[PDB]
Symmetry: C5
Subunit: 311 residues, 5 copies
């Protein structure tokens, strides 16, 4: 069960290929996704070569135990992949054609800074560690790389499954390692975003601005504070549908700015009343009348600035 | 062992049959369902044939290790199915009758656009990959296909377990694959829907409309904003019982429209008061009196339109 | 090994018996419960008979491999039971006495229509499939059926562990199946129900009725709407302790009726004010005075009707 | 292998000892705790005795397969313990010294009646079933019983790991069973209890009592009802940190009483206003002035009574 | 196989080294983290030595079964690590160079007292138990200790992976144990902290202080109580992002103090009104005017004190 010796002083290329059968369970929080696929490997072990005339067979089938197979692993997997050998076939030249069906919870990092308009690149990193007797490098057989059309990620759009053909060969713990990058590109499709999240949140915010057409401090306090409780309650409602990140996101910025417009509104309401009370009613009414065009315009600009900064 | 050699240039039919023992744990979010069933396969391996006179037995029982068994897999499963061989029986001609009891978390997509009146078609896809020496196709033995009467999905109605008899044989990674479609049809039975979700939500909304029989801006602000907080609180309460989807659903549309009727009501309340204040009390009262019939009628039409658009 | 041949044309009775060691983890939502128990089986395999004089032994102990054992399974289990053979003992006549300790997540349906006064019957169904050479039927050895006194289900009262002695023998996929019904009876013991759920919910409701001793529309709107938000908030608080079902439950009906009494109260408040406003103050006060006895009495009757309808 | 024969008509004592390596994951809801430990057993199998002169060795090491080992199990475990044999050592007399490292989710019942001042006794029950040929009893070797000092349960204080030396030998399914009680004593250490739970809850309650220094029914209704919503909201906030039990707990009683003080306060507010309105202002003010000392004193007594009843 | 005999009366040093491949899934609540890594061990077994001239090979590769390997375990792991041997290489002197890839859920305690500015030290404890025939001690080969640069913990900053070179050799259950401390240092990086948690919480608090520029008791009660409900609602919103601990944390203290400033504000509001009412309007206005500078300054000091006490 030794590796195949070299003809000359060359490494062994193992011709890889992942075919996605069923991609599912993307955990935006944990930055994981479970995948169920085919892994196809191919190398040349001349020890296993045969004359198809004497053998009377075109292709000899082997058990994993019977022949030498390279130790292929995944870099960013949670635990060991649940792989099951489908077929091992040796052509007369000694070309081994290996196939296995596996399933693994992959760990690719996610970027929600542009949420819900963010797009991702999910990584599946294939490694192989060079042995003492001979060095091993990974190749990409593009014919054996693809994805099933049924493969779905609800709320996403599966764009492309490609692979960086060039391996990232490097040194590790005194041995050569050959790494390959398999990239799954998914772009978000949150259709019900503006009616589920933005629209009711803008309604609750606009309700507060009716305090610029009112003069009752008691009515204005109710308007601005009560809508503020409504805003918070609504955020607890859409808490589920929102990115729980240590960094500021696009949607997250909008929401923040909204809490600020509640604060500024309160200040107005308080000032209008203080001026009214301090017998400066002309200034009081001037402000409430200005706020009527000021608050909507400033909101619109600040939101245009935001969108520009994130995109 | 090796596969059984052909009489002629025909393929080997493996006569499949799934009998649902206990279907359970449907995760509307993950679009999964766990199933516990019997898988029955049958093929003819003439190598295993015998004279029942000399053997002194009518049917010989075998261990999976002892004889060749086809590599049958599921396409849309999360991990490998937890199968346990029940019985392997060979008749004197070499007809193998295999039976196993398995359990697997299946991944069929779900459609909640018509919630809570939606119905589903759960798929269980059976494959087999053709070997180098001989090609393999799947057949459906309808006698060995059914479901237990006890099989329950709480809140659903299990209608039919059928299978597309015709296999979808296709090319994959340079080998013949034979696919079978087993379909489980379930139609929703949400009995407590109108009293758990719709009725209290309509009450909270009607309470707001009492502001059309009021003239106190301070009472109307309390009525329309406070019921709005009640609406949001109620949604957090029924949050559990509602479809968390990236697309707009039926119930989801109703709810949206309700947040809009809160916004429109506030506008009314604000306008009635502004006219009252601007010494146009006739216009103010005309509106509040109109809103009295306007809001209920428009709600009813818009809800009739909705139902028609979704069904 | 082969099954034991019949003396005559009789089936083989396997004398079953489940002894519950530790019953736990009942998931009211999933309708599951995990159980840890002993399964005792006994049959007569005359091939294994011996003369205790020559053998010099009263009982011979065997390994599962060494002797024939019937394929016993559970019908309503999630996955395969984690069983471990305790002891296999053969008496001189050939009577095999098998014992194993297992653990399985059982799937019995639950009925919460009468919550929190509901009682359940948890089912553990034992099957055995008849072989080609001989048919097999299950018997109940009542001596080997019981439960440990320590066995607890927090919030329940474990009443009785009994079994329908008569097996439900039936045809399946062309073979005889012998089914047994093991029934675990548990009756709910929700002691802190009236102070955790009912009492604070009645207080929040009574607070609203103080609007019948008030004449301030502005105070009444606060009373009826604010307590309504308090009711909803309280429901979110007891959300945990309540049955999440597709059907209407007892507690669920009470709660519904309460949302209706909020609606009716609002109507009153609105009417009293409209009459007061429309210079019909005599009618206005007549209603508020009537509501004072009307609301409590109607509540009491409607609640008496409810209890009668559910019990 | 067979069990060791007796010298005389005596049973075999298996000298047990559990050493807690890492105790963790206590699920107050499920009444479970996961433990990682050493199990040390010792018995005398004279068949394995040797003369250390001829053998030239002091202690012979054996594989579990090679020698007879007693079937030791846990009573209250969820599934079978994940045990791994560390060492098996036989002294010249035939004294087997077995050691294994295991991990199991134990199921001990919990008592939260005195929460957050409750203390628990976690049980680990060791059994062994007597064989047909000889009976087996369990002994405690106190030298081999202890716990690591690092062993932590966050929010608890691990007091003592002791064992009831005397086994509870009993009859089960016609065989002798020998049970041992290993007790882990943990006393609660909820430090941030009064500032996380009690203090903000008393503040929200006191705010309501400011209604005794007010005469505005409209202000009092806001005070007593709004603080009531604040109380409910706060309970939803500390919902996580509170015992979800079918029985009444200490903290649970305090909370209940608080909902009652809200009810009584509302009654006051309503009565004071009704008397004021019914031109009995002297009685109205007498009550509000009394409530000022009445509510705090009654709260303090009722809370003293409570604490006395639970402790 | 047996362990390697000593040259003299010296123990066997096993030269350890952990290289972190992918560190992930840190459960702040459970105080656990899952890690996927390489474990490299090396010792000298002279029985395995060879002359590379006669063997004609530089390094001989072995199967775990073929040669003796030390029983290395982890102390603070939940269950047994999912290890898979990568390579076993023996140099001519008998130096075994072992490598395995493992994955384990580690259990290190966490300190959130300084949250969200807290830093942690995650522990991975390696043990080996001395055998009867020879004692074993662990050494650290610093060359074989490191971490991949891709290794991420979202919201944290992975600072250093080091190891206490000196083993903590001790007596346990009458045998020598050799323990090693591998330390992973992570410092928190909560970027969106002040806008996600602090800023909206300060806004809700400031809104309450506008009651010092108001004289309407009815407006002040709404201001202070309503913002109090907003505070509680906001805490339920950031409940997810906050440390659930039995001890007081930094952020936890800030929040507490905020509930106290709500209480103090209510007292003010109530006092100002009582003095106004008791015909002492000069004192009433003096207080409200003082509170205007008093509340902000006292808040700032108390927060400066806090920060100093925690840091
Ligand atoms: Cl892997
Ligand atoms: Cl499968
Ligand atoms: Cl089973
Ligand atoms: Cl066990
Ligand atoms: Cl370990």
């Amino acid at each position: 069960v030794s590796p195949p010796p070299p003809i000359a002083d060359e490494p062994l290329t193992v011709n890889t290929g992942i075919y996605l059968i069923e991609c599912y369970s993307l955990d935006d929080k944990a930055e994981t996704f479970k995948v169920n696929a085919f892994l196809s490997l191919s190398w040349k072990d001349r020890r296993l070569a045969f004359d198809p005339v004497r053998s009377g067979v075109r292709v000899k089938t082997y058990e994993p135990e019977a022949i030498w197979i390279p130790e292929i692993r995944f870099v960013n997997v949670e635990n060991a992949r649940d792989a099951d050998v489908v077929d091992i076939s040796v052509s007369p030249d000694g070309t081994v054609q290996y196939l296995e069906r596996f399933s693994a919870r992959v760990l690719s990092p996610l970027d929600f800074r542009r949420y819900p308009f963010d797009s991702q690149t999910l990584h599946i990193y294939l490694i192989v560690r060079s042995v003492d007797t001979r060095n091993i490098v990974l190749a990409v057989d593009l014919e054996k790389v693809g994805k099933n059309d049924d493969v779905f990620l609800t709320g996403w759009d599966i764009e492309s499954f490609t692979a960086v053909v060039k391996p990232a060969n490097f040194a590790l713990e005194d041995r050569l390692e050959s790494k390959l990058d398999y990239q799954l590109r998914i772009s978000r499709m949150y259709f019900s975003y503006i009616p589920n999240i933005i629209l009711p949140m803008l309604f609750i915010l606009f309700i507060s601005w009716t305090a610029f057409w009112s003069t009752s401090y008691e009515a204005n306090v109710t308007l601005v504070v009560s809508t503020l409780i409504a805003h918070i309650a609504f955020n607890i409602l859409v808490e589920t549908n929102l990115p729980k990140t240590p960094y500021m996101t696009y949607t997250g910025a909008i929401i923040f700015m909204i809490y600020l417009f509640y604060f500024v509104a309160v200040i107005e309401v308080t000032v209008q009343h203080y001026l009214k009370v301090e017998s400066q009613p002309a200034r009081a009414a001037s402000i409430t009348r200005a706020s009527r065009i000021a608050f909507p315009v400033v909101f619109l600009l600040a939101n245009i600035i935001l969108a520009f900064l994130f995109f």
